[PDB]
């Protein structure tokens, strides 16, 4: 019933030269997945840091489990479940859980993320001897552990010590983001967050316009990567690549995303695309827009980056706005979109939500500079602290799910939940967009190199 979304097919409007532009709309109905939805706390245990991956028919879903008052040091195991996304006669898909595992060892599995390839599930975890509130910022960590899972049961476990991981930076702490990894070539590629020393600052992304009460923009930009009193500890994103050889030997590498390519280490995920992969990031910091970096064979550079000025992060729920300028305020909320075309020039995601200020969640479909469609949703939540959107083919139609963490209004209970909604694809003469007041418009491009708007009257 469920397969990966074929992005090339979804965007193939080429047989329609008179309506050649792909576009997308959000279907008005949100559908529950009750078997994948649960409170954070239940009967002396907490289930935190949810992460999900989708494969051919299967999903892989995982939470870190803690006992007692649910501090970091109370972590007891990693719960992982594998099931299928199926039609059970409802208007939206449902989960059919097949296997649940409780993964554990003497060391803590301090941070884990999941991936799926075909009907095989993978769980990659950072291991540590001690796990505290400070592990994410200062470590230490001892290595990685990789679990291979199928419907029947666990197949294999692999591990590698930190000293055997090839790295291009001085890495003091390593955490995996909640977004899934992706199988690419014979490897698994995951996004990580690392505490790093001795980094190069050349080319740090930083505006050159005037910023309030700042003469040295560059220094403010560099300083804003730091989360602790240690002046030589920068919080940055890394790409974690793991391989298992036929002999069953695990190798791993961790590659820094330099300051010239990305902002402070933030949540995100790896995106599969034809011919490569991308890194979708929901910045914690002052550059408060979604960014997407993808492999670029043509360009000698590794990653080509897209800034979605149209798609704000949750930054402004809790930090002051204004001209985009380096400041210290950060949010830990995050919203990871996914791509709807091969190049990621069209993305879809779900906004977060505060309990104040007329804050509302929205599903939004965007290009870098425009909003294609948006829909206010999740009035049943008083707040939403994180979202991860993933899309797939179900019943031969484009569908998406969102994994979110938030507080339900009716009960005040914090929950992790997964819900689904259908997408509508069409091929159009002129793609329409929404202006800041919600009026729909399109551009009547001209051959001399000009564009003018026009209002869509329904
Ligand atoms: C999203 O951000 C909010 C605001 O910073 C976080 O809520 C704060 O942090 C904890 C809640 O766990 C409390 O100590 C504070 O009182 C909260 N403030 C408010 C206004 O609620 C929230 O935890 C974040 N959620 C995620 C998933 O990042
Ligand atoms: C690192 O890898 C080498 C080569 O496989 C192996 O001999 C060595 O035991 C590993 N080190 C640790 C600490 O496991
Ligand atoms: Mg369900």
Numbering used by the authors: 174 to 631
Task: Please quote the paper that reports this structure.
Recent discoveries of several new Paramyxoviridae species, including the zoonotic Langya virus, have revealed much higher antigenic diversity than currently characterized and prompted the reorganization of these viruses into the Henipavirus and Parahenipavirus genera. Here, to explore the limits of structural and antigenic variation in both genera, collectively referred to here as HNVs, we constructed an expanded, antigenically diverse panel of HNV fusion and attachment glycoproteins from 56 unique HNV strains that better reflects global HNV diversity. We expressed and purified the fusion protein ectodomains and the attachment protein head domains and characterized their biochemical, biophysical and structural properties.
A crystal structure of the Gamak virus attachment head domain revealed an additional domain added to the conserved 6-bladed, β-propeller fold.
